[PDB]
């Protein structure tokens, strides 16, 4: 039968007031025999009616997928309200319900440092700039590199790793042409996290 | 019914001649009523008799698990020999077989760099030393920090990340007391990977 998964908003969306956070309910293995899936939504058990719901054909295995995207208030997520989807269909013996909310826990802002290329690497054509983001809680975070404030393309992040002390850390690696590194620049590491002032910080090199 | 999962040796075990690589066959959801699983082992279809097999209770959901651990020859894994477990039980309609072997692919040795603390961190009570390990294939790798040849305690690794070009990279973060960094030390990063001479390299500072 159909099964149901619930997904949180993207951390960047829920921390940036200008963005549009969404909680998503996905119903997989929907059948064309009973395709009229109903998804109802509740915020602390108060029903809301604004979700955008669409059916998609998954040709990988000839199934249907119903995706319901509920737009949410930033503060409702951040204050810990519960978001619940209730899934009804003619082929379900009983409704399926899923709930998600922001976990409780300590907040610790990340320490953000940018590290120059290793000296041994300076004889190469391309060099590596390292953004180190550490000592942060919870693990939800958004990290990017920018050049002149304009988001880069050739950067790669690690996933956050749990430390022994309970905080997390990650790195963002940026490969640049050595010419651009030696010449004066504004390569910067941008970090979006709950613990930061205005949920955002940037870090640049001194020279 | 019972299901069967097979697992390769740990990369450190199979690359280091002093260690003991194992291929493991796990039979999950064995029943109290028919618990007598017979597990036979084959290396390139030649039967071998050295595996150690044990039954365990899983208290999370009150089930049984049979774990069969085959000690293997390092070179047999590295040269691509196939390792096969055949699982018999009376509640099985037919035997279940699993095979595993070293995946094919290109080998590229890691570039290994050690990075000093960010200058803005040097006045704090603790500093971070970074081992940056890049440009390696396959992703299977082992990294540690040592001081005076002894393995450190307060280091944590990221999991390898796939780069655009098909290579992988990771970081190992060693946090030390700033006093110990400033005074003479021998902090070093050791990397175990198939592409390295004797599968091992080390990188130190102040050189
Ligand atoms: C036909 O083909 C279909 C297409 O492949 C296939 O659909 C797939 O079905 C599987 C289930 O069989 C389902 O798997 C789940 O995936 C969850 C993660 O989904 C993410 O990421 C994957 C890729 O990693 C994507 O494919 C998904 O689309 C989804 O992407 C996210 O989408 C949201 C909203 O669109 C975005 O906002 C995100 O940004 C985006 N992320 C990314 C990275 O892209 C995963 O969470 C599920 O795991 C949980 O359930 C399992 C049980 O099924 C457990 O084993 C597992 O441990 C997890 O358990 C949960 O654990 C929590 C904490 O540990 C608990 O709190 C929960 O209660 C617990 N849940 C349960 C149920 O126990 C799961 O692996 C795929 O998502 C789905 N793909 C799509 C595209 O729909 C069909 O199955 C095929 N059918 C047949 C008959 O063959
Ligand atoms: C009771 O509770 C126990 C304990 O939780 C539970 O046992 C687990 O059962 C699940 C299956 O239901 C097992 O899942 C597999 O895990 C594999 C990894 O296992 C390691 O890591 C986990 C933690 O991450 C440890 O718990 C574990 O001890 C090992 O260290 C994973 O590899 C498996 O995934 C493969 O198989 C599934 C199909 O089942 C498939 O969906 C995956 O995509 C993947 O498929 C394989 O893909 C490769 C390509 O990459 C392909 O080559 C290969 O052919 C595919 N193989 C198959 C079979 O498809 C899977 O997720 C888990 O290991 C069990 N844990 C333990 C500790 O035993 C019981 O199931 C519970 N029982 C009940 C009744 O509740
Ligand atoms: C990530 C993880 O859990 N890996 C382990 C693996 O090391 C072990 O060999 C296997 C056999 O039990 O079980 C699993
Ligand atoms: C200890 C148990 O082992 C396995 C998992 O599938 C369970 O969720 C739990 O982690």
Tell me the resolution in Å.
1.9
The strands making up B200-204's β-sheet, listed across from edge to edge, are B150-151, B142-147, B188-192, B200-204
Atom of ligand 3 nearest to the CA of B24: 11
Domain boundary among B76, B101, B126: B101
Whether residue A74 is found in the same domain as residue A10: yes
Query: Cα angle at A118 between A117 and A124, to 5 degrees?
Result: 75
What distance in Å separates the CA atoms of residue B93 and residue A184, rounded to the nearest whole number? 71
Residue of B64, B72, B53, B60 whose CA lies nearest to B29: B64
A 10 A CB-CB count for B102 gives 19
What distance in Å separates the CA atoms of residue A86 and residue A114, rounded to the nearest whole number? 46
In three-state secondary structure terms, B29 is strand
Taking contacts as CB-CB distances below 8 angstroms, the residues of chain B near A141 are none
CB–CB of B170/B141 below 8 Å?
A: yes
Into how many domains does chain B fold?
A: 2
Whether residue B161 is found in the same domain as residue B61: no
Whether residue B115 is found in the same domain as residue B92: no
Query: Cα angle at B18 between B14 and B21, to 5 degrees?
Result: 30
Whether residue A121 is found in the same domain as residue A97: no
What distance in Å separates the CA atoms of residue B129 and residue B189, rounded to the nearest whole number? 10
What distance in Å separates the CA atoms of residue A122 and residue B47, rounded to the nearest whole number? 54
CB–CB of A43/A74 below 8 Å?
A: no
Peptide bond into B50 cis (omega under 30): no
Q: Which uninterrupted H or E stretch holds B180?
A: helix B178-182
CB–CB of A7/A100 below 8 Å?
A: yes
Domain boundary among A83, A101, A119: A101
Q: For A109, phi and psi rounded to 5 degrees? A: -70, 145
CB–CB of A37/A52 below 8 Å?
A: no
What distance in Å separates the CA atoms of residue B35 and residue A66, rounded to the nearest whole number? 42
Q: Which uninterrupted H or E stretch holds A108?
A: none
Whether residue A63 is found in the same domain as residue A130: no
Q: What residues contact residue B197 under an 8 Å CB cut-off, 6+ apart?
A: none
What distance in Å separates the CA atoms of residue A191 and residue A110, rounded to the nearest whole number? 8
Q: Which of B28, B64, B101 to mutate to test the pocket of ligand 2 (most atoms within 8 A of CB)?
A: B28
Whether residue B163 is found in the same domain as residue B144: yes
Whether residue B107 is found in the same domain as residue B204: yes
Q: Which uninterrupted H or E stretch holds A188?
A: strand A188-192
Domain boundary among B83, B101, B119: B101
Q: CA torsion sign, A18 to A19 to A20 to A23?
A: negative
Q: What residues contact residue B131 under an 8 Å CB cut-off, 6+ apart?
A: B112, B113, B114, B115, B143, B145, B171, B172, B173, B174, B189, B191, B203
CB–CB of B82/B43 below 8 Å?
A: yes
What distance in Å separates the CA atoms of residue B47 and residue B37, rounded to the nearest whole number? 17
Instruction: Quote the domain boundaries for residue B204.
Output: 102-207
Whether residue B58 is found in the same domain as residue B111: no
Nearest CA distance, A150 vs chain B (angstrom): 21
CB–CB of A66/A53 below 8 Å?
A: yes
CB contact under 8 Å between B115 and A113, yes or no, is no
Whether residue A189 is found in the same domain as residue A151: yes
Residue of A177, A198, A85 whose CA lies nearest to A126: A177
Whether residue B108 is found in the same domain as residue B207: yes
Taking contacts as CB-CB distances below 8 angstroms, the residues of chain A near B134 are 128, 173
Length of chain B: 207
Residue B115 Cα distances to A119, A121, A129, angstroms: 9, 11, 11
What distance in Å separates the CA atoms of residue A78 and residue A102, rounded to the nearest whole number? 7
Tokens for A116? 């120059």
Nearest CA to ligand 2 atom 20: B7
Q: Which of B6, B22, B24, B58 to mutate to test the pocket of ligand 3 (most atoms within 8 A of CB)?
A: B24
Q: What residues contact residue A154 under an 8 Å CB cut-off, 6+ apart?
A: A174, A175, A176, B164
Nearest CA distance, B163 vs chain A (angstrom): 7
Q: What was the structure determination method?
A: X-ray
């Amino acid at each position: 039968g159909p099964s149901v998964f619930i997904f949180p908003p993207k951390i960047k969306d829920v921390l940036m007031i200008s963005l549009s956070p969404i909680v998503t309910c996905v119903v997989v293995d929907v059948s064309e025999d009973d395709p009229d899936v109903q998804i109802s939504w509740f915020v602390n058990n108060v029903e809301v009616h604004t979700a955008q719901t669409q059916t998609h054909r998954e040709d990988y295995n000839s199934t249907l997928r119903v995706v319901s995207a509920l737009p949410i208030q930033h503060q409702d997520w951040m204050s810990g309200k519960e978001f619940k989807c209730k899934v009804n269909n003619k082929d379900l013996p009983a409704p399926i319900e899923r709930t998600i909310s922001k976990p409780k826990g300590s907040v610790r802002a990340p320490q953000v440092y940018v590290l120059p290329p290793p000296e041994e690497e300076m004889t190469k054509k391309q060099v590596t700039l390292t953004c180190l983001v550490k000592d942060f809680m919870p693990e939800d975070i958004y990290v990017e590199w920018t050049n002149n404030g304009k988001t880069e393309l050739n950067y790669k992040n690690t996933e956050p790793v749990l430390k022994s002390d309970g905080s997390y850390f990650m790195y963002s690696k940026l490969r640049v042409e050595k010419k651009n590194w030696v010449e004066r620049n504004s390569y910067s590491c941008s970090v979006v996290h709950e613990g930061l002032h205005n949920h955002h910080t940037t870090e640049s090199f001194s020279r």
